[PDB]
Design a protein around this ligand. Sequence first.
Ligand SMILES: OC[C@@H]1O[C@H](O)[C@H](O)[C@H]1O
Ligand SMILES: [Ca+2]
Ligand SMILES: [Cl-]
Length: 302
Amino acid sequence: GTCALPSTYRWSSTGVLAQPKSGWVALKDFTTVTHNGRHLVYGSTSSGSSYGSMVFSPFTNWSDMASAGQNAMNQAAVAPTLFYFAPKNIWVLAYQWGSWPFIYRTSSDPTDPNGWSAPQPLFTGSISGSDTGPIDQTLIADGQNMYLFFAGDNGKIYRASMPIGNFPGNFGSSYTTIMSDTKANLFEGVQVYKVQGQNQYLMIVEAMGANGRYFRSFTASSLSGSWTPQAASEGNPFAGKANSGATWTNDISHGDLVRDNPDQTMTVDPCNLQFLYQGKSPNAGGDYNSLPWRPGVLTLRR
Ligand SMILES: OC[C@@H]1O[C@H](O)[C@H](O)[C@H]1O
Ligand SMILES: [Ca+2]
Ligand SMILES: [Cl-]
């Protein structure tokens, strides 16, 4: 009863799933788990003049995201990563912009935007040739090691690791540069997942295409291994204008595959693959920071 990832992706898409509550112009950079049978979603927020973060009140159906409470975090967790860390029975929210290049907080109740612990350092390193520095971290463990992957708005993807026994903890300053391409080809929004029922991991990376933001996919047999391009061009993307089935947006941008198992392995089921993404009206212009990003969900077609 196991499925494989396809070599060519075709999706259907929802429309816009929610409008930002009064005071925000955008909801962004989603991370999501299923928690007690309900979708639990964190994301960045923007007023146009500053970035923050929020959690949606848990909801069973994506069609009900529009009515879900939108709960601001009192301390911003921009571009967050949410997961349950089973070896220490603790939830983790990792993010950027704070006292360190990457930061994390922990909790016993991930539904509370303000129940998170004091911030701790996740990563303290620096990268060359980047206007942003380290951006858009994700975390993923196999059975042995916890990995940090991140981007730099600069065509590179970076990786760090520690024994899982040492997590939650600080990766420190060291990293490996694992991919190098043009800025457009490997820009930001990197995510890594375990493919359930396959000896395979999936990496997606947001690229800047001629027609809008899209995702390029890569596979590996191991988290410390080499990545092989899978659906890695604008014409044959993991997800983009070419194959999203979305009419409301020409951009498929920073989000999260839907993770039914909330744990640190970031496992996705290739039999029922779905993608919570940010998109925007093709008509929306102005400064990047004020763009009206909105949540949508792609469902992989049989
Ligand atoms: O939303 C803040 C930054 O903008 C981009 O969406 C990037 O992915 C994120 O780190
Ligand atoms: Ca992310
Ligand atoms: Cl490493």
